[PDB]
Amino acid sequence: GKVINDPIHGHIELHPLLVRIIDTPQFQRLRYIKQLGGGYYVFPGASHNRFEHSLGVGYLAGCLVHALGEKQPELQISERDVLCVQIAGLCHDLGHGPFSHMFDGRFIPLARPEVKWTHEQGSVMMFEHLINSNGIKPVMEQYGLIPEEDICFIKEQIVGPLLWPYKGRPENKSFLYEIVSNNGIDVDKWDYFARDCHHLGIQNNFDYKRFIKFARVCEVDNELRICARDKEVGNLYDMFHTRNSLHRRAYQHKVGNIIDTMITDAFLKADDYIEITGAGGKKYRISTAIDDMEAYTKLTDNIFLEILYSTDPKLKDAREILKQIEYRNLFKYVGETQPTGQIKIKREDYESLPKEVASAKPKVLLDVKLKAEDFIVDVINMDAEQLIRVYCKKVDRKSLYAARQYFVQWCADRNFTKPQ
Amino acid sequence: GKVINDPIHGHIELHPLLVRIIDTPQFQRLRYIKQLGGGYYVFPGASHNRFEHSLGVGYLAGCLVHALGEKQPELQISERDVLCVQIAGLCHDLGHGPFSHMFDGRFIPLARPEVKWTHEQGSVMMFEHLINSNGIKPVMEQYGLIPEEDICFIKEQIVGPLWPYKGRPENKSFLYEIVSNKRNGIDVDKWDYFARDCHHLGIQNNFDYKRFIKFARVCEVDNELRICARDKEVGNLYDMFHTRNSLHRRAYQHKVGNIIDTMITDAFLKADDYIEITGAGGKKYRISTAIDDMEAYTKLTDNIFLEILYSTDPKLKDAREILKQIEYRNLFKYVGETQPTGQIKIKREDYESLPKEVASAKPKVLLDVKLKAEDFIVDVINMDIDHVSFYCKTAPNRAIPEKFAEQLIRVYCKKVDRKSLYAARQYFVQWCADRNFTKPQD
Ligand SMILES: [Zn+2]
Ligand SMILES: [Zn+2]
């Protein structure tokens, strides 16, 4: 049993079972993955990592579930349920890789387009690896938990299911599944909204303690849901204003997103040569460490500096891109487009995108002809739901003018909105 | 030109010459050195690094020197002066090593007791290395700086020295109290890290630095021009000293935080024969010798912690297992604290000898368990209105708590079983008596 002091939430009280889960290599790993990935290179206040965010989610999940239980004792929320919701909140982000959403949002689709990987699935596998490598099951049993049922409950809270599709808890407790990851209103967003604003200097006027006070479980369409009070909607709209401010000012920051693609580019040029030893001694690459949780345990933002400090000549190309970040010679912005309709470019097809741009035939024939390797195509998703930006690695005014020509034509070819 | 958004100071406008100093590998290296060292392992909000703090000192040094310049043209503060004071503020911490004060405060004294190293000497050497590796001298001249004098002025502002300085004459005495004031203890460096640390630690800081800068003036105090605060800022100054006191007592001197610093140092010492950092000309350096070559030093950051932790080399297993104790939270055990009240203080050159002294103390009641030097950690904790001069608004040209102990000594034990901890306490009590240090409290 411990208290951890956090600048966002103050004193965070942790049950002994939560402390045993936290003080493992699988959890402490999150200290080395920056929350905003490459955003730190734009926002110096944004040095925070997934670890303290995870503590905050575990704390918030516990407060909300405990407050529901005290106000409504008929829900039959047990102290076993509370701990399991806290574990899910603590562990929901175990699966993130180097630079957070850059890794599963961009790097893995570009290195292995045929593989389906999410950080959430990663959190389930890391959670299983954490449980199994630290003898956590006996400590769960020691504190009232029933491992087989509750471990499944925790995983379903993180990833969802595989008519009532959940096995960890029955349908009369369906509201427990809305706490950690939802409506789009869960305690995970509460923590990172507040924490990101604190680190970015952005005012945040959503008050989570007030939403907890007035949370109750009601029935809607013969289903139990967490609902807020009547006139408490204003606090709600303040949360959505903070969501949009954060998305507009930080998450979609043009230079932030460029730098992430540069880091990804360096990881790709390094993926053949970095070795990470996993289970039994087997060796893995950055792109295959997701296949072995012992190797994944050792895959963090440190990969950036392993490349940057390396001397192997084979890592020269990767190294040179990171060096371009330090000297601030970044890829150059070409323009932005959106797919019309409800069409979404799928992660599977990211790698094909630069080729399509280089295959466009700009009407006027430009002096400079560019190759698919000179183009970056950055697909920015939100949950306008998809934006597409193109950057060019060639800096000369000549290549940049040509790069815009390929980009403009490519949008027409796919009938995307025309660049402005 | 460029602008950087910072949560403490808001928009930080950066002159193009500062931008060119910042966008170098020597400066960006500060992104990989945590401000509080091992404190992050006790305070999850304290993920911040020396990079963002150095931007803030650069910013604050500029605001103060510009404010004095605009309100007191008689001081002849040039736009060249402002830039030099900004550069010094930006570059004053370039010399920190992995985990900041742990590195020069503890690791180098224990690894090379014969060397005299400070991060401030490091900052000068790294600043020089930054200048010459990135062609900064021409960019200086392009903006009106005279490199030979101005580089000297910048270095003296960082490291220190009748008038002993050569970068500026004595009539600009006051420029040397902006970035680093050892005499007074009130500089813009502390203003940033007070505000920044409180922000990441959730400690309220009532010191309002902008208001203090607004009312700062240069006045002659005993034949020297010195920066002075308006007399009505005494309440704001109280708030600064209360913040200083809170930070030292709750954070800088935290018991678990300091134990973790010694564990990391212990791991570096166990790894030091086996890590190699490639310096200039391809020559190989170690964690402890990377200070002798700024090319190797550029690549020595907190990364070394994970290099050790993720290693598979059987030669790094001992170092690696210490770092794993941190992750499992099986830390060294606190034994007690003492102070050398009324005695000569312990010096860096003697840190290495302390564990053998403790283990050699002869507790008069013989005990079962015998402990050796290697089971003991001896952690020496140094802390450093005395000379703060005021002025009144009517005569604007004529000048007008609970002191923390100078040196604290804590002892930790690596044996965790409880008979050994009892024995460690007996050795420690006897050692304090042997050295006429204060008797430890229960
Ligand atoms: Zn999260
Ligand atoms: Zn500093």
Residue numbers in the entry:
A (entry chain D): 115 to 276, 284 to 303, 306 to 506, 546 to 582
B (entry chain A): 115 to 275, 284 to 506, 515 to 530, 542 to 583
Question: What do the authors report?
Answer:
Identification of SAMHD1 as the factor that impedes infection of myeloid cells by HIV and SIV brought to light an intrinsic cellular antiviral immunity mechanism that relies on controlled reduction of deoxynucleotide triphosphate (dNTP) availability. To counter this infectivity block, HIV-2 and SIV viruses encode an auxiliary protein Vpx, which targets SAMHD1 for proteasomal degradation and facilitates infection of noncycling immune cells by these viruses.
We then investigated the stereospecificity of the interaction. To further explore this, we used NMR to investigate the interaction of SAMHD1 with the d(TG*TTCA) oligonucleotide containing a single phosphorothioate bond after the sole G nucleotide. In the anomalous electron-density map, location of the sulfur atoms in the SAMHD1/ d(TG*TTCA) complex corresponded to the Rp stereoisomer.
